[PDB]
């Protein structure tokens, strides 16, 4: 009942009063983010609450954040909170724990170097052209456009060709066998889990594998097919070459490819939607970005790896968007052993949590946090931003391994789209933007905007 609910009272840590069995989960009615900001505003730098019986400790002090994410990663704060009915996804790098995660991180780290990324941009760029070609049609109809569907088809085009070498236009090919199987995904089951964490083992024995055994065996056979028939430059080849610590197994290969698919579709499509909202509701910013793009890329020259990393205002626009909308919302680590960090006893089993969304909007570090102002990230003001307040990709050894790939993928899309189109709010546009009430950082209403052709 209230088994471990006396933990934060005994340590003298403040926080909302938990209910028996439920803990503080009813306080999620306003959203993960609004709960984090309220607890921040009403308790200060550190507070605690309970996801059911699971005690969660929020910290907002930069030095303590650095200690948890960097200084004591391998020793105390190595793993994230487990775990829904896992299946074979236990071998996924973002799921793996302790030395198995360390093994996977080192086997996959060379795959995300700038050298391998630079070799992926000619393929990624090919679907930027496909993107504008499908945008040209939906724009000439002369009526608002749902960016979630055009960026979604784009994001899937990129991940299918970067993960396996499958080159298909998703929007105009409604059902390639690969496209549909990848679209087979995916509340309130997620809150049932945190309040019934003891029922997770039962889902394993019931053969209730979270992923459909059809799509799972489809990818596992698609990969082993691909393995057989096989100078390719996709994530699969980069992982097959690393098989010739201890090399990756074939099932471990499927697990990582599944992760990248999940990693790319939700994030990049949603962040591209947030950027286009901000660009459309701040026309002066949209114009300055297009003027910069036309400068480095004359007469709509194709963007390359080197020309992308040269665009400073583009990087300022991406970073300021990722401040207002950090899609991960939270950072989490489990405390492996009793530790004292920066004058504070953290007992074993506690989940330490960094409220990224709340920190990106705290008036202590940001002037007028609610306004979209790219000038915060100019070279002049970039220096006074604490890299442990602003953590859109986490930090430390377990930060986002695909950060460079995601920034490069989104910028290549933004450049090609802004070279050809302008974006204005229409009447269906939700202004101001409201965030979804659920447990994901996405717009409450799908972003709809006017698209004109240059």
Q: What is the dihedral of CA 76, 79, 83, 85, to 10 degrees?
A: -140
Q: First CA to last CA across the chain, in angstroms? A: 63
* Binding-site partner at residue 367 among ligand HEM, its own copies, none, CB < 5 to 8 Å by type: none
Cite the beta strand spans of 81-207 per DSSP E: 145-146
Q: Between 76 and 95, how does the x/- string for binding to ligand HEM read (CB under 6 A)?
A: -----------------xx-
Q: Which does 328 bind (CB under 5 to 8 A by kind): its own copies, ligand HEM, none?
A: ligand HEM
CB atoms within 10 A of CB 323: 24
- In the complex with ligand HEM, the residue whose CB is nearer, 7 or 33, is 33
Token match 């052993």: residue? 337
Helix, strand, or coil here: 258? Answer: helix
Q: Please name every residue paired with 340 in a beta bridge, in sequence order, or none if there are none.
A: 345
Euclidean distance between CA atoms 137 and 135, whole angstroms: 5
Is 374 one of the binding residues for ligand HEM (CB under 6 A)?
A: no
393 binding ligand HEM? (CB under 6 A)? yes
Instruction: Quickly list H helices, 141-234.
Output: 147-163, 177-183, 189-195, 200-205, 213-229
Tokens representing 370 are 């609610």
- Characterise 447 by phi-psi region: left (phi > 0), alpha (psi -120 to 50), beta (else): beta
CB-side neighbour CA atoms (13 Å) of 147: 31
The Cα–Cα gap between 319 and 314 comes to: 9
Helix axes 98-108, 250-281, angle to 10 degrees: 70
Closest distance between ligand HEM and the C-beta of residue 454, in Å?
26
Radius of gyration of the chain (CA): 23
Site for ligand HEM in 313-332 (CB under 6 A): 327-328, 331
- Name which of 179 and 318 has its Cβ closer to ligand HEM: 318
Query: Which does residue 398 touch among its own copies, ligand HEM, none (CB within 5 to 8 A, set by kind)?
Result: ligand HEM
Which partner from the list its own copies, ligand HEM, none does 164 bind, CB cut-off 5 to 8 Å by kind? none
CB 107, min distance to its own copies, A: 16
Report what 430 binds from its own copies, ligand HEM, none; CB cut-off 5-8 Å by kind: none
Q: Which stretch binds ligand HEM (CB under 6 A): 43-51, 226-234, 386-394, 444-452?
A: 386-394
Site for ligand HEM (CB under 6 A): how many residues? Answer: 25
Residue from 139, 289, 401, 418 in contact with ligand HEM (CB under 6 A):
401
- CB of residue 201 vs its own copies: minimum separation in angstroms? 4
Residue nearest to ligand HEM (CB): 394
The contact mask relative to ligand HEM for 220-259 (x = CB under 6 A, - = no) is: ---------------------------------------x
Task: Tell whether 400 is in a known binding site.
Answer: yes
| Residue ranges in contact with its own copies by CB under 8 A | 1, 99, 197-199, 201-202, 204-205, 207, 337
- Burial tier of 355 (Cβ tally within 10 Å: 0-12, 13-18, 19+): buried
Smaller CB distance to its own copies: residue 203 or 440?
203
CA dist list (Å): 45 to 123, 316, 352: 45, 28, 13
> Cα separation of 336 and 347, whole Å?
9
Helix (H) or strand (E) holding 121, with range, is: helix 121-140
Choosing among its own copies, ligand HEM, none, which partner's interface includes residue 204 (Cβ < 5 to 8 Å by kind)? Answer: its own copies
Binding site: which residues?
400
Binding site for heme: which residues?
400
Residues that bind ligand HEM (CB under 6 A): 69, 93-94, 105, 259-260, 263-264, 267-268, 271, 327-328, 331, 392-395, 398-402, 405-406
């Amino acid at each position: 009942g209230t088994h471990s609910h006396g933990l934060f009272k005994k340590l003298g840590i403040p926080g909302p009063t938990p209910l028996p069995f439920l803990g503080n989960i009813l306080s999620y009615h306003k959203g993960f983010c609004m709960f984090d900001m309220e607890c921040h505003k009403k308790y200060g730098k550190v507070w605690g609450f309970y996801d059911g019986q699971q005690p969660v400790l929020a910290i907002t002090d930069p030095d303590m954040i650095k200690t948890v994410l960097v200084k004591e990663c391998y020793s105390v704060f190595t793993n994230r909170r487990p775990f829904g009915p896992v299946g074979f996804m236990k071998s996924a790098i973002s799921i793996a724990e302790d030395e198995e995660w360390k093994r996977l991180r080192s086997l996959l780290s060379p795959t995300f170097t700038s050298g391998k990324l630079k070799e992926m941009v000619p393929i990624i760029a090919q679907y930027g052209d496909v993107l504008v070609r499908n945008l040209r049609r939906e724009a000439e109809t002369g009526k608002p456009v749902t960016l979630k569907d055009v960026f979604g088809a784009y994001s899937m085009d990129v991940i299918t060709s970067t993960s396996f070498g499958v080159n298909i236009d998703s929007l105009n090919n409604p059902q390639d066998p690969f496209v549909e199987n990848t679209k087979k995904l995916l509340d309130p089951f997620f809150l049932s889990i945190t309040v019934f964490p003891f029922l997770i083992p039962i889902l394993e024995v019931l053969n209730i594998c979270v992923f459909p055994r059809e799509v799972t065996n489809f990818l596992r056979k698609s990969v082993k097919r691909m393995k057989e028939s096989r100078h390719r430059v996709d994530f699969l080849q980069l992982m097959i070459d690393s098989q010739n610590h201890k090399a990756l197994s074939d099932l471990e290969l499927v697990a990582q490819s599944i992760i990248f698919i999940f990693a790319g579709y939700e994030t990049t499509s949603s962040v591209l939607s947030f950027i286009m909202y901000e660009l459309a509701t701040h026309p002066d910013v949209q114009q300055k970005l297009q003027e910069e793009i036309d400068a480095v890329l004359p007469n709509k020259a194709p963007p390359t790896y080197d020309t992308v990393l040269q665009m400073e205002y583009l990087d300022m626009v991406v970073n300021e968007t990722l401040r207002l909308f950090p899609i991960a919302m939270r950072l989490e680590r489990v405390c492996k052993k009793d530790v004292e960090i920066n004058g504070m006893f953290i007992p074993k089993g506690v989940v330490v949590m960094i409220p990224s969304y709340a920190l990106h909007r705290d008036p202590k570090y940001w002037t007028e946090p609610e306004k979209f102002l790219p000038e915060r990230f100019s070279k002049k003001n970039k220096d006074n931003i604490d890299p442990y307040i602003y953590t859109p990709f986490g930090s430390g050894p377990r930060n986002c391994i695909g950060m460079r790939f995601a920034l490069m993928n989104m910028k290549l899309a933004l450049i090609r789209v802004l070279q050809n189109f302008s974006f204005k709010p229409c009447k269906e546009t939700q202004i101001p933007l409201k965030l979804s009430l659920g447990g994901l950082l996405q717009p409450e209403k799908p972003v709809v905007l006017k698209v004109e052709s240059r």
